[PDB]
Amino acid sequence: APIFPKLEDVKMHELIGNNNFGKKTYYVERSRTGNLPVYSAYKNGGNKIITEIRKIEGDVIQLRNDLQEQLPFIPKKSWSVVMQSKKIIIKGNAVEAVKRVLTKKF
Amino acid sequence: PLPNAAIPPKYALVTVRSFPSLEPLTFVPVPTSTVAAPLRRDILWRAVVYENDNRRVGASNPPGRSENGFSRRKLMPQKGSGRARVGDANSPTRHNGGRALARTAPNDYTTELPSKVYSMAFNNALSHQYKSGKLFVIGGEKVDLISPTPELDLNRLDLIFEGEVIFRKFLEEFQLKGKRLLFITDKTREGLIKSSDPYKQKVDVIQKELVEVNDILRAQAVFIELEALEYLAMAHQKE
Amino acid sequence: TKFLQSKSGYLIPDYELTTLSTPLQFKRYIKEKILPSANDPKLAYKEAEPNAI
Amino acid sequence: VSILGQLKPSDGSTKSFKRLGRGPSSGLGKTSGRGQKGQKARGKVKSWFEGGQTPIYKLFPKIGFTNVGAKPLKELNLKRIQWFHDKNRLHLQPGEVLDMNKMRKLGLVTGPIKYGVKILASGKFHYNLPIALEASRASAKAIAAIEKAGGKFTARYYTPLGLRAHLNPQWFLEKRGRVPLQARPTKRRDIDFYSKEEKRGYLVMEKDKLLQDIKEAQNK
Amino acid sequence: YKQYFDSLPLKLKSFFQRYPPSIKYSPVSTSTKAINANPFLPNKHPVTQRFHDPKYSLRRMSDVYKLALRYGVEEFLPPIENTKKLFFEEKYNKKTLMKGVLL
Amino acid sequence: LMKTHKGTAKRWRRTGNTFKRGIAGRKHGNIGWSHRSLKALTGRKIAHPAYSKHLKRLLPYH
RNA sequence: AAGUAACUUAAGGAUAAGAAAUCAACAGAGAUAUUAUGAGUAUUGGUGAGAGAAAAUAAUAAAGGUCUAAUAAGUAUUAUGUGAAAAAAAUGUAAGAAAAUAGGAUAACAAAUUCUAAGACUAAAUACUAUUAAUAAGUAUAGUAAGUACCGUAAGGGAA
RNA sequence: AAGUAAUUAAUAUUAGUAAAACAAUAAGUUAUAAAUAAAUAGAAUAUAUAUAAAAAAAUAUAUUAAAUAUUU
RNA sequence: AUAAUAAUAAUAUGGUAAUAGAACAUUUAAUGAUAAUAUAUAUUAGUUAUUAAUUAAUAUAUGUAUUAAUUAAAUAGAGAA
Ligand SMILES: [Mg+2]
Ligand SMILES: [Mg+2]
Ligand SMILES: [Mg+2]
Ligand SMILES: [Mg+2]
Ligand SMILES: [Mg+2]
Ligand SMILES: [Mg+2]
Ligand SMILES: [Mg+2]
Ligand SMILES: [Mg+2]
Ligand SMILES: [Mg+2]
Ligand SMILES: [Mg+2]
Ligand SMILES: [Mg+2]
Ligand SMILES: [Mg+2]
Ligand SMILES: [Mg+2]
Ligand SMILES: [Mg+2]
């Protein structure tokens, strides 16, 4: 309810630099509706079909690696991460698989 | 499973102060989204540019061959002269004439931006400022203070007139004489503005609701009320 | 932290305060950052050129 | 110093626009992409001009008409409802009937609703919610599915104004401390539809007065 | 009670000011110069038998009635019955459906 | 602002991506021709790619 | 193109419009003015070129309702000739009604709704000028001279 | 001394959000279901189903939807 | 699993109309140190694969850049009327 809680409410491990979140870890936020931010996209005039994993906090590279480990049948060279907006683009339309891989952790 | 799947830190501490000097009274935990957002400069750029566009006056009004003063008379007959063909004396081809593709009266340079994006940009700016360490929050009445607010100094962001002198002293103390600063205020602190107006060139004093991303970014050091900050956070929330 | 600031003379950025979780750490940070500029004055950080060397 | 003088847009966002008539090496030199000497090269010729051969528009016969009496309904699939339920974004113990208004409140049916909602059976095989549903109508299959689920569908009639009132009577209340009552059907077709049993209409499922009145009239 | 009255909409108040409930205005048409003459009805002038157009144009009257209904004060207005305008629930009740609907 | 070419609208109708239209050639002069042959001249037909662009420009809101 | 340019006439600080013989659809709204949406939708066109509403919801707005008619015929209406590319309201020529138990509104009729013509007043939002204040990714060939020099009989043109 | 502006439309790229998006006063726009001139019709590997012409119902033609899971 | 630079092998590098990609000059706005030993413009001679910029000398300003750089834009480049 309140935008800023009182000092007593917040614990020490909920502040910055106290989780060790920067060092090789990541987190995928769910959407407003509460769904996994994995989407299909039809680029270049509906002709190429890619998938896009969005709301990622932390090391995207690590996340990508983990995903690859989970589902190895998607070739390694078809995993294109963009660093400016931190999202990882997969060549095929493999959304469902990605979602499956995700849900079980967060 | 997915290893390395941590939970993110959701809060960040901003030390509340007292504005004539700046003596730290309390820590306040503000959410990570409004003060520790990763620096996405492209988002910022989108905002700033947009703001600039909206700020334009757009008064470029040269005369086209229609608005230019001359008559419509054909200066020379079509043939018989041995010269090049001529129409009216308003052609942009001739020195006295109108301008080709003239821009006319109020030019509209205004652009759109999704509200959410703008909010994000604002948040990002704030985060950047905080990271720099040039964000200073001032407040007292609303939160429990650890150290007690000192005497001769209040938490309102307010002050020959004496106030001006005090302001000058503060500036001297804080090594921020020449640099530009931005006071984000919950209400019209008239006294403060009066005090500052000698240093008007380098001082922005802004009401809460009218603060701009550009203004924050421009400012070398920002001073904001706690309440104002809260309001801002609420505005540019996320949901 | 407040005490440290007051004794020191130099105030610490709030981000730093948020981050560092031990006195030793704080000391280390101080050593890294504010000590060198105190000894050598022209080695200090002028904002106009942040990429200064 | 400040970040303000070192901001760039995102890679791929912006291109240089093509500058015509600005020297040969640029690529769009003198003729500036127009070629030579045509009508096109200076004057304007409508892009879709056909040369004087009868155009694609003028060749073919004009066909059909727009039914202005038509009212296109927003379609809503059982599947979507089921999904919503699964998610837990569907709160129906308070209001036992899931009406159009309720749907819109939920998100269930989004955007504006002009005429009404038709329920459709997309995920009938996986639908199982014992719920009272109300909408402007439903496909037979959908209805069947609902009945199987142990649910209860009825198809109601709403005129535009009536529909609006239904969707948010709060506004109406704010305006003139009242909600406008529901209009009866008047178009014969509409009346017929609501009478029909198989369509699951609100005239026979509620046993309305209007039908009775009509019957009486017929008798006398 | 006075306060409550004051709170009421402006138009209604205005109406009350010139046509108060102290007097009982005739249901049916009347002389135009009688003091129990209904504003809402087309009354007739004695000299020259000419029906005067209602002192309240129909729309205005309707509006007034609606306002009254909203704040319960229907009975303190003069009676509308002889104008063919009915309102809301009563109208709904008493409506004979059209020939086209019935058969 | 820009507006639909009404003639085109009257002739053509939007079906997913493309547009449909009535076959030309059936209005009159039909006798003597085999009715099995004239079956082909009835019914709708889909827009040729060649002219899709033109159609699009004609009816920007369909 | 366009009821635009132009010519002509008349008023005012503004003018026009304005409290429904209006819209709507059997549920309703409630003066005008003009901006978003509706909508380039309905409507319409040598069905070419093209033209194109209204209801409704929002803003802007002001106290916005209020009698000054003994309540209105050569008027409504009809016929005929004209008449805002889509929606009439107007109008020349002759025929020519009715009392609220009555009129108008829809190709037509039957139901039902709604309004009351032939009497009126009306701030505010708006247009244009002039001044002041502010803001200029506006102008020094859009930076004050001059409507001068000069050109033409003249209207008129017009420098540095 | 010469490719500009306004109001729109369609494509692309990138960003924001995402089964929703923009706007969030209420509306409204696009997406979420294809089809038909129009109508009270409308989705489980396809060989099942939806709409159109046809019809008792299929077939046949066109386009669509449909494959321990997490909707497009 | 990137970028920058350098290698090795290979293939490719004429071009009107035209399409695509990348830069520079000029001017304005946002941010912005600095300094008469500095700067701006000009001439001459150098330098960097060079429409540009820089170095040295020289001449004229000027108590001094809308200066470097990133954005935003353009009355943004002329032997062809
Ligand atoms: Mg070329
Ligand atoms: Mg040729
Ligand atoms: Mg040529
Ligand atoms: Mg050509
Ligand atoms: Mg007037
Ligand atoms: Mg008047
Ligand atoms: Mg016109
Ligand atoms: Mg009368
Ligand atoms: Mg009247
Ligand atoms: Mg002379
Ligand atoms: Mg080449
Ligand atoms: Mg030029
Ligand atoms: Mg030259
Ligand atoms: Mg040359």
Swiss-Prot record, chain A:
Protein's UniProt name: Large ribosomal subunit protein mL49
Gene Ontology CC entries for this record: mitochondrial inner membrane; mitochondrial large ribosomal subunit; mitochondrion
Its job: Component of the mitochondrial ribosome (mitoribosome), a dedicated translation machinery responsible for the synthesis of mitochondrial genome-encoded proteins, including at least some of the essential transmembrane subunits of the mitochondrial respiratory chain. The mitoribosomes are attached to the mitochondrial inner membrane and translation products are cotranslationally integrated into the membrane.
Family of the protein in this entry: Belongs to the mitochondrion-specific ribosomal protein mL49 family.
Record localization: Mitochondrion
Highest taxon in the source lineage: Eukaryota
Note: Present with 1700 molecules/cell in log phase SD medium.
Organism: Saccharomyces cerevisiae (strain ATCC 204508 / S288c) (Baker's yeast)
Parent-protein residues present: 41 to 146 of 146
Known partners and oligomeric status: Component of the mitochondrial large ribosomal subunit (mt-LSU). Mature yeast 74S mitochondrial ribosomes consist of a small (37S) and a large (54S) subunit. The 37S small subunit contains a 15S ribosomal RNA (15S mt-rRNA) and 34 different proteins. The 54S large subunit contains a 21S rRNA (21S mt-rRNA) and 46 different proteins.
Keyword field: Mitochondrion, Ribonucleoprotein, Ribosomal protein, Transit peptide
GO biological process terms on file: mitochondrial translation
Gene Ontology terms for molecular function: structural constituent of ribosome
From Swiss-Prot, chain D:
GO cellular component: mitochondrial inner membrane; mitochondrial large ribosomal subunit; mitochondrion
Localization in the cell: Mitochondrion
Ranges of compositional bias, category Gly residues: 24-36
One of the protein's GO biological processes: mitochondrial translation
Region (Disordered): 12-42
Assigned keywords, A-Z: Mitochondrion, Ribonucleoprotein, Ribosomal protein, Transit peptide
UniProt superkingdom: Eukaryota
GO molecular function: structural constituent of ribosome
Miscellaneous: Present with 5350 molecules/cell in log phase SD medium.
Record note on quaternary structure: Component of the mitochondrial large ribosomal subunit (mt-LSU). Mature yeast 74S mitochondrial ribosomes consist of a small (37S) and a large (54S) subunit. The 37S small subunit contains a 15S ribosomal RNA (15S mt-rRNA) and 34 different proteins. The 54S large subunit contains a 21S rRNA (21S mt-rRNA) and 46 different proteins.
Function: Component of the mitochondrial ribosome (mitoribosome), a dedicated translation machinery responsible for the synthesis of mitochondrial genome-encoded proteins, including at least some of the essential transmembrane subunits of the mitochondrial respiratory chain. The mitoribosomes are attached to the mitochondrial inner membrane and translation products are cotranslationally integrated into the membrane.
Family the entry assigns: Belongs to the universal ribosomal protein uL15 family.
UniProt protein name: Large ribosomal subunit protein uL15m
Gene: MRPL10
Residues of the full protein shown: 58 to 277 of 322
Swiss-Prot record, chain E:
Signal peptide segment: none
Subunit-level organization: Component of the mitochondrial large ribosomal subunit (mt-LSU). Mature yeast 74S mitochondrial ribosomes consist of a small (37S) and a large (54S) subunit. The 37S small subunit contains a 15S ribosomal RNA (15S mt-rRNA) and 34 different proteins. The 54S large subunit contains a 21S rRNA (21S mt-rRNA) and 46 different proteins.
Record gene name: MRPL25
Keywords: Mitochondrion, Ribonucleoprotein, Ribosomal protein
Descriptive protein name: Large ribosomal subunit protein mL59
Role noted for this protein: Component of the mitochondrial ribosome (mitoribosome), a dedicated translation machinery responsible for the synthesis of mitochondrial genome-encoded proteins, including at least some of the essential transmembrane subunits of the mitochondrial respiratory chain. The mitoribosomes are attached to the mitochondrial inner membrane and translation products are cotranslationally integrated into the membrane.
UniProt family annotation: Belongs to the mitochondrion-specific ribosomal protein mL59 family.
Subcellular locations according to the entry: Mitochondrion
The UniProt record lists the keyword Signal: no
GO cellular component: mitochondrial inner membrane; mitochondrial large ribosomal subunit; mitochondrion
Phylogenetic classification of the source organism: Eukaryota, Fungi, Dikarya, Ascomycota, Saccharomycotina
More info: Present with 1550 molecules/cell in log phase SD medium.
Species of origin: Saccharomyces cerevisiae (strain ATCC 204508 / S288c)
One MF term in the entry's GO annotations: structural constituent of ribosome
Biological process terms in GO annotation: mitochondrial translation
From Swiss-Prot, chain F:
GO biological process, one term: mitochondrial translation
Recorded GO MF terms: structural constituent of ribosome
Annotated localization: Mitochondrion
Keywords: Mitochondrion, Ribonucleoprotein, Ribosomal protein, Transit peptide
This protein's GO CC annotations: large ribosomal subunit; mitochondrial inner membrane; mitochondrial large ribosomal subunit; mitochondrion
Transcription regulation found in the keyword field: no
Assembly and oligomerization: Component of the mitochondrial large ribosomal subunit (mt-LSU). Mature yeast 74S mitochondrial ribosomes consist of a small (37S) and a large (54S) subunit. The 37S small subunit contains a 15S ribosomal RNA (15S mt-rRNA) and 34 different proteins. The 54S large subunit contains a 21S rRNA (21S mt-rRNA) and 46 different proteins.
Job description of the protein: Component of the mitochondrial ribosome (mitoribosome), a dedicated translation machinery responsible for the synthesis of mitochondrial genome-encoded proteins, including at least some of the essential transmembrane subunits of the mitochondrial respiratory chain. The mitoribosomes are attached to the mitochondrial inner membrane and translation products are cotranslationally integrated into the membrane.
Similarity-based family: Belongs to the bacterial ribosomal protein bL35 family.
Name of this protein: Large ribosomal subunit protein bL35m
Organism: Saccharomyces cerevisiae (strain ATCC 204508 / S288c)
Covered range of the whole protein: 54 to 115 of 115
